[PDB]
Design a protein around this ligand. Sequence first.
Ligand SMILES: Cc1nc(-c2ccc(OCCCCCN3CCN(c4ccnc(N)c4)C3=O)cc2)no1
Ligand SMILES: Cc1nc(-c2ccc(OCCCCCN3CCN(c4ccnc(N)c4)C3=O)cc2)no1
Lengths: 49, 297, 297, 245, 245, 193
Amino acid sequence: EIGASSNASDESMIETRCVLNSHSTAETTLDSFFSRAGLVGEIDLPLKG
Amino acid sequence: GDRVADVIESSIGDSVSRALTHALPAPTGQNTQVSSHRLDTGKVPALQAAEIGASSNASDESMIETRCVLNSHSTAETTLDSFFSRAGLVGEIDLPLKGTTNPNGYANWDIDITGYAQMRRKVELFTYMRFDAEFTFVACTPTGEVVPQLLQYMFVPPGAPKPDSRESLAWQTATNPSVFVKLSDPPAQVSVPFMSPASAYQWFYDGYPTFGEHKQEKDLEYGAMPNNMMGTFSVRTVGTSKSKYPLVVRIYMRMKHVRAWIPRPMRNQNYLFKANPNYAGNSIKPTGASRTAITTL
Amino acid sequence: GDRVADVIESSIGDSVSRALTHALPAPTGQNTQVSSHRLDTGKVPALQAAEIGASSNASDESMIETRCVLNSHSTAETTLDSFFSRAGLVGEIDLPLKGTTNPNGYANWDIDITGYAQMRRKVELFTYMRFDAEFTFVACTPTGEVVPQLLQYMFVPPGAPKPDSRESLAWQTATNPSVFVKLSDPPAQVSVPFMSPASAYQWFYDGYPTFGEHKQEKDLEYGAMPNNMMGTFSVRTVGTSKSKYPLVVRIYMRMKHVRAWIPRPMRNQNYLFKANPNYAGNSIKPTGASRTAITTL
Amino acid sequence: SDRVAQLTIGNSTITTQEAANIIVGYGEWPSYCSDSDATAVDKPTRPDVSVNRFYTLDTKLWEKSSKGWYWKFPDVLTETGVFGQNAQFHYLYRSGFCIHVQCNASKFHQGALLVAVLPEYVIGTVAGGTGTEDTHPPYKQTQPGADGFELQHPYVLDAGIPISQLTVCPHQWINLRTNNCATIIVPYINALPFDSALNHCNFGLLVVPISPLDYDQGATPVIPITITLAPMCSEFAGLRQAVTQ
Amino acid sequence: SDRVAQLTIGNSTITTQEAANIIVGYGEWPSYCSDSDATAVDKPTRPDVSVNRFYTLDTKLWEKSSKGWYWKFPDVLTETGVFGQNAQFHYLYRSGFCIHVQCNASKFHQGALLVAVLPEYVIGTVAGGTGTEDTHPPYKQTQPGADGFELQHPYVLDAGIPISQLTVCPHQWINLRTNNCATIIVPYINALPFDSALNHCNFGLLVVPISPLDYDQGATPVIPITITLAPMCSEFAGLRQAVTQ
Amino acid sequence: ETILEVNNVPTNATSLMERLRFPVSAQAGKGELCAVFRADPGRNGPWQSTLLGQLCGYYTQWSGSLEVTFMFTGSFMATGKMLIAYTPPGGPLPKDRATAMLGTHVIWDFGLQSSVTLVIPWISNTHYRAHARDGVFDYYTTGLVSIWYQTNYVVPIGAPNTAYIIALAAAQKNFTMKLCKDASDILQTGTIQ
Ligand SMILES: Cc1nc(-c2ccc(OCCCCCN3CCN(c4ccnc(N)c4)C3=O)cc2)no1
Ligand SMILES: Cc1nc(-c2ccc(OCCCCCN3CCN(c4ccnc(N)c4)C3=O)cc2)no1
């Protein structure tokens, strides 16, 4: 009801092991998410239309 | 508390790989040393036992009389980069005018190196491979002629909408990559990372991908790991109307930054299918040549 | 090598019994201290919650006004030695002249305390017991008269030949113990160790001794652990011919060097059988007495 | 603080809001066996996750004319999980248990249970009623399974002993006004360091209503009772072929 | 010193008098997984005795017209022991193997086998013989069980690859004049730290006679071949209900 | 956290808000089934309502642990308990409550704290998982969630007999994504004019 997300984790609910995570978070940034070209317009210059 | 003794002396929890061997340098072949005659008992390098499954260790020095030879012959061209980083054909994509394959000006090609056997038989020496790559695209009509035409390429990863036509909406390529290029220009050419979820591309998977009662109608998924299907490669002639010119597109792969594992034997029978090691049974040709007599050349 | 971390921090191999409690001395009852009146909030010893399954902790001081009382009442007679080390009847062996039980001048008695309920109901308060013992034998004719007769006793352990007659060869007692004694002499009396393979005599075994398909014809072995059947006790009138006198032999057990475990409830229905907690169902008498009205004595 | 509780062992987890404190049977925690007490020489196995977790047995019903129940441990788990499929292979067994019981109800219902743990709870028959006829209890009343078995004469617990004195054992109540569960932890109770898991049955859980369930019409009549439990500090020894019984 | 050998792991034990040295496949020993390589968070289980011991599969026969055999690991043990009854529960699996092979004979017999270990030994059919007809191998040839499966075209190992080059793998021979057994130790060979035990089949043992058995009449014709093997450093993860296949 | 559409049976435009919550009513007490759903975010299903399942359309592979929070919109004078479970890959859909129990599971008592968190840890042979669908790409299936009754739904006189539960899907701090792409849902028919 407070409108905040949970805080429970794998450690405090079950039995885990040690895991040394090296997975980068660099491709979820905005430059790496938006700096990819895409179509935005078209302009026609026909002969007779 | 670990108060018992069988827990203290336990071998459990050993993240270390006990390695008997250890690598050494060898920028040149070995220098043959000098030897002389020996007429002793006990010492006997010739007599081996091969049941153990290890190779011999006898050498030129311990079997005959040699001289000193200072060998400077390099071993640099037998490496893997110097053996694999040589481009070869991996695919073909046709965009003809009127036919039956791909007449509507588009084509989808499933990314799979296993369609030409000069390059397949080099990689099938190994099992697991980890490599970057460098594709290269050569466009041409059937006559080899070069024509003023515009072309679009688009890497379609897994889970993305495959285009179904030339005037489709999947070609906006906002998030997917793409390559516009002409034929009057040189070949297109781009680089590729290691794109798998796993830690290596295995050219040989002994198993089924899914669980279930494996019936005979679902045996076509033997030897299929989806950690190698790296997606699809689309191509089309840009426009709203059909083109004036037929086209053919050839794809070359060049591997770099290579690491390999698990040597295993080499194909000797002709290839037939993809993702499938099958061979012709009524036409088992020997591994090599033949003759008439063991006592004669 | 234990190089992982989940093996280092592991709780496996803990031969220690984490005990919340710890014993204390109490040679006398507790001395009641002085108190006065209190008129505070929060503090409230009367209100308990018994759902937890723990007993109360309120005392005379914290409920009313008391005085100082220096209690010197000992707690030494409620111990187990001072509660169990009191002889009682455990068996009877008849050697009559002419009857049907044991007319041929010998008798075998299976060592089992569970045949008289004054002593059975004391031990059946506990489950596991570890005790030495001191048997005592009282011989007499039915009239109580004392007669000049010689007698032999012989402890027959498990796996030993039970005698089948008065003139048998099992009476040489080379390795077994024995007690010659007369009736004109006082009672015989000897000491006994803890003779079990286990670490305690359990008066209650919930299980079957053997493996198998437990059919209805082999349900008579429910509640039978052979770690309590400590053997057999034989007795006979010494001679080659029959005796002139009937006899009766009564056996008394006195426990000493006692240790007990596992308190549990106490019998309230009459005993019927041995090694068997059965009760009469149509005759379930209450635990105690009764009356006519809850509002009246 | 004393009401809310959580119980995390294994892959599993339990929550509860209206509870009470936790009990430790006979005042101490479970443990693995010492090298002094032990006698067997073979090295045990100690999985530590696949066996030491919460298993859920079966869900009873509590009417107004209910009398009681019992379950024998560790018979309840001899056909359930990697626990049971080890206990059939091996011959020797050692463990503790945590035991959690559920029964919920609203604030208009009333009742009380008694959740006790008795070691070596032998069952005794009625001797034909007359007293003379010797009988014995069948196999489905001494090892009834995970589906439990119902009492016929609960005032004597079917063994000639009153229920009035069952509180001297590790006990708890479920008074529906106050709480809705009972958590009991138990060590390994036996004279021998190891013992079989199929023949021997070390103790029995009992659930007997003292004050009967009652309510008024328009209210939910179905008042289930669920039994949850977890092995702890489980060892095994004497490997060989699997033995059902 | 190099001939006599003994192999003690678990409750079990092996002796042999006329043997050879021991091989370690691809030059290193088994191991448990590192906290860096691993990805899953759940705590595994590591029994260390009930699974890491010698199991004996089945006893073949070696006639004069024999061609060869293969077995897929670890499919051979998915219905055998506390090993198999863990591999059905869990989803993830990791292990090594020691592999011992038996074939005895007198000093008048002669022959030679080749005992090789090939990772990812896919099986390929004959394409109808003509080459055009696409087919696939059935389920009882890719996971044939503990009873093994016999080869039809051993010169190509039923996969388009010669047997002449099978020595580049971890190999041994059984020349009946010299030795009578072959001991091979293998680590866990896969690109992924954990992988299933039912679908995936990491490698295949092969036994192919090169020089055929021969003898003279009056001599014992039955020359069996027995296959013994032991897991090592076995881990499991992802607990749930048992899955046969 | 964003709302999860477990109740995705309706289609008509009047009853679309019914997707948000599933009910729980009063039953006998046999330990019976209420709902199921997969733990596959990028796959077609309940997870498309989320901001997580729509940001995994612009990225192929994923990793990390997930979390699914439930909430109870019933009356204060009601009680009950539930058995939430996570059945990892390989295993079929559980038929009874005594089979889903053998996996990762959570038990929750209705009370003041009107919510509970199930946690879907990372159980995989692979470090990463490309998205799943019917075919050979079920090699990357996450599993199943399977909700059950532990005791019953008890309620006194005067209150309603049926309640509603709301769910809330999200991720944990070890989630990652890579290999960006374009999604399948292209929200355009012809020309935006
Ligand atoms: C703009 C644009 N980008 C691109 C662009 C196009 C494609 C790319 O992926 C190149 C990845 C090469 C994948 C090579 N492997 C690995 C395993 N394997 C197989 C196949 C079949 N069977 C088996 N057993 C194994 C296989 O074939 C990257 C980039 N070009 O245009
Ligand atoms: C010379 C000579 N020596 C002796 C001489 C004779 C006998 C001796 O053993 C005395 C041991 C007392 C054994 C006492 N217990 C322990 C458990 N238990 C039972 C019995 C039946 N059911 C159950 N559930 C338990 C029982 O009855 C020692 C010495 N006398 O003569």
